[PDB]
Design an enzyme around this catalytic site. Structure first.
Site, PDB file in Angstrom:
ATOM      1  N   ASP A  90       2.259   2.631   7.733  1.00  0.00           N
ATOM      2  CA  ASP A  90       1.186   1.715   7.369  1.00  0.00           C
ATOM      3  C   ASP A  90       1.679   0.279   7.182  1.00  0.00           C
ATOM      4  OD1 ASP A  90      -1.502   1.449   4.874  1.00  0.00           O
ATOM      5  OD2 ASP A  90      -1.356   0.762   6.935  1.00  0.00           O
ATOM      6  N   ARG A 114      -0.007   9.156   0.689  1.00  0.00           N
ATOM      7  CA  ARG A 114      -0.786   9.236   1.933  1.00  0.00           C
ATOM      8  C   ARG A 114      -0.188   8.444   3.094  1.00  0.00           C
ATOM      9  NH1 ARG A 114      -3.461   4.302   1.147  1.00  0.00           N
ATOM     10  NH2 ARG A 114      -3.406   4.000  -1.145  1.00  0.00           N
ATOM     11  N   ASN A 115       0.679   7.489   2.781  1.00  0.00           N
ATOM     12  CA  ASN A 115       1.281   6.611   3.780  1.00  0.00           C
ATOM     13  C   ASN A 115       2.742   6.973   4.089  1.00  0.00           C
ATOM     14  OD1 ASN A 115      -0.831   4.900   4.570  1.00  0.00           O
ATOM     15  ND2 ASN A 115      -0.579   3.528   2.794  1.00  0.00           N
ATOM     16  N   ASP A 133       0.845  -1.219   0.000  1.00  0.00           N
ATOM     17  CA  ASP A 133       0.000   0.000   0.000  1.00  0.00           C
ATOM     18  C   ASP A 133       0.879   1.268   0.000  1.00  0.00           C
ATOM     19  OD1 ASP A 133      -2.401   1.438   0.008  1.00  0.00           O
ATOM     20  OD2 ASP A 133      -2.670   1.367   2.180  1.00  0.00           O
TER      21      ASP A 133
HETATM   22 CL1  LIG Z   1       0.439   6.521  10.126  1.00  0.00          CL
HETATM   23  C1  LIG Z   1       0.517   5.979  11.771  1.00  0.00           C
HETATM   24  C2  LIG Z   1       0.704   4.626  12.057  1.00  0.00           C
HETATM   25  C3  LIG Z   1       0.762   4.181  13.378  1.00  0.00           C
HETATM   26  C4  LIG Z   1       0.646   5.139  14.366  1.00  0.00           C
HETATM   27  C5  LIG Z   1       0.454   6.459  14.073  1.00  0.00           C
HETATM   28  C6  LIG Z   1       0.376   6.918  12.780  1.00  0.00           C
HETATM   29  N1  LIG Z   1       0.182   8.285  12.539  1.00  0.00           N
HETATM   30  C7  LIG Z   1       1.165   9.257  12.802  1.00  0.00           C
HETATM   31  C8  LIG Z   1       2.391   8.862  13.334  1.00  0.00           C
HETATM   32  C9  LIG Z   1       3.290   9.853  13.565  1.00  0.00           C
HETATM   33  N2  LIG Z   1       3.026  11.128  13.281  1.00  0.00           N
HETATM   34  C10 LIG Z   1       1.826  11.424  12.778  1.00  0.00           C
HETATM   35  N3  LIG Z   1       1.643  12.804  12.506  1.00  0.00           N
HETATM   36  C11 LIG Z   1       0.433  13.432  12.185  1.00  0.00           C
HETATM   37  C12 LIG Z   1      -0.754  12.749  12.081  1.00  0.00           C
HETATM   38  C13 LIG Z   1      -1.925  13.425  11.779  1.00  0.00           C
HETATM   39  C14 LIG Z   1      -1.900  14.782  11.574  1.00  0.00           C
HETATM   40  C15 LIG Z   1      -0.715  15.479  11.669  1.00  0.00           C
HETATM   41  N4  LIG Z   1      -0.729  16.877  11.457  1.00  0.00           N
HETATM   42  C16 LIG Z   1       0.548  17.535  11.350  1.00  0.00           C
HETATM   43  C17 LIG Z   1       0.306  19.049  11.324  1.00  0.00           C
HETATM   44  O1  LIG Z   1      -0.603  19.402  10.275  1.00  0.00           O
HETATM   45  C18 LIG Z   1      -1.866  18.780  10.534  1.00  0.00           C
HETATM   46  C19 LIG Z   1      -1.668  17.269  10.401  1.00  0.00           C
HETATM   47  C20 LIG Z   1       0.436  14.794  11.982  1.00  0.00           C
HETATM   48  N5  LIG Z   1       0.856  10.529  12.530  1.00  0.00           N
HETATM   49  O2  LIG Z   1       0.379   7.259  15.182  1.00  0.00           O
HETATM   50  C21 LIG Z   1       0.610   6.295  16.218  1.00  0.00           C
HETATM   51  O3  LIG Z   1       0.687   4.949  15.721  1.00  0.00           O
HETATM   52 MG   LIG Z   2      -1.090  -1.697   4.134  1.00  0.00          MG
HETATM   53 MG   LIG Z   3      -3.178   0.650   4.042  1.00  0.00          MG
END
Ligand SMILES: Clc1ccc2c(c1Nc1ccnc(Nc3cccc(N4CCOCC4)c3)n1)OCO2
Ligand SMILES: [Mg+2]
Ligand SMILES: [Mg+2]
Ligand SMILES: [Mg+2]
Length: 273
Positions: free
Chosen positions: A151, A137-138, A133
């Protein structure tokens, strides 16, 4: 690793995932400096298959260590809600980050982002991990514009399973769609689409074409054209990634080498169609 929930402070809800919220917060454990974390939560009303599907992402991430792969800090499992904590990527997902900054990063910067993603993929392929994937977006982006792959999950796509997620057709190599043969070589095709997403500052691959329009177009030799202003050498690397014969596509070390060459020779990026 199990994190004591006392060590975690949640600051703001910043997004949504498949199973719940994504939050920003702070991790502080004895003997370590406090750090910023992203927190995925899984609240009440879930099944155990779902709980294990959720937590599989952490199991997989915890198998990897690389500067272009999202780092796991740990999990909270003996408490509610169930949580996965990773490093915090301050600029979020690349597609939206690029659409927000349309036309505002230089080619050299965009090539550096693509180099980072390719290095992540190079590492995953070396680990015999097939992503399946790979899409902008990932890819997550930190405050220094370092791109990291995210992801992780090993669950078959819905089409691979009992007769009675879906394949991301627009990112997916033709043989992977037709035969569900997903390999690092099909990941290289997806990387080509990621390149196009980046050089287009987050436009949707194949615009309004339907999934079956995409499948037919590709089978009939159509390939995405160069985004506006895109250096020809990058578009050609895209076309190499999009060869119908998976064995003719570049492997990820070659992809990284090609991008590094571009960075060493930035004059070559001035040739545009
Ligand atoms: Cl993709 C993913 C996978 C597993 C996991 C995650 C994610 N998401 C993730 C991981 C690290 N950083 C982010 N940063 C982020 C997510 C959503 C919005 C934003 N903003 C940054 C500032 O502008 C608005 C969006 C940052 N996400 O968080 C905890 O466990
Ligand atoms: Mg996947
Ligand atoms: Mg996926
Ligand atoms: Mg445009």
């Amino acid at each position: 690793k199990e994190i004591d929930v006392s060590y975690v402070k949640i600051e703001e809800v910043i997004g949504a995932g498949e199973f719940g919220e994504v939050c920003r917060g702070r991790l502080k454990a004895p003997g370590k400096k406090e750090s910023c974390v992203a927190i995925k939560t899984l609240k009440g009303g879930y099944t155990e298959r779902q709980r294990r599907e959720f937590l599989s992402e952490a199991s997989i991430m915890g198998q990897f260590e690389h500067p272009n792969i999202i780092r796991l800090e740990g999990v909270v499992t003996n408490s509610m809600p169930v949580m996965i904590l990773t490093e915090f990527m301050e600029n979020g997902a690349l597609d939206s980050f690029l659409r927000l900054n349309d036309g505002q990063f230089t080619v050299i910067q965009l090539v550096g982002m693509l180099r980072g993603i390719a290095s992540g993929m190079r590492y995953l392929a070396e680990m015999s991990y097939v992503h399946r994937d790979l899409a902008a977006r990932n890819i997550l982006v930190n405050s220094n514009l370092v791109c990291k792959v995210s992801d992780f999950g090993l669950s078959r796509f819905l089409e691979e399973n009992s007769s009675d997620g879906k394949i991301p057709i627009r990112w997916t190599a033709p043989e992977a769609i037709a035969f569900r043969k997903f390999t690092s070589a099909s990941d290289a095709w997806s990387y080509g689409i990621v390149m196009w997403e980046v050089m287009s500052f987050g436009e949707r691959p194949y615009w309004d074409m339907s999934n079956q329009d995409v499948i037919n177009a590709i089978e009939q030799d159509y390939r995405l054209p160069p985004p506006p202003d895109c250096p020809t050498s990058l578009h050609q690397l895209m076309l190499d990634c999009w060869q119908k014969d998976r064995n003719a596509r570049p492997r990820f070390p070659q992809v990284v080498s090609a991008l590094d060459k571009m960075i060493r020779n930035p004059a070559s990026l001035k040739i545009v169609a």
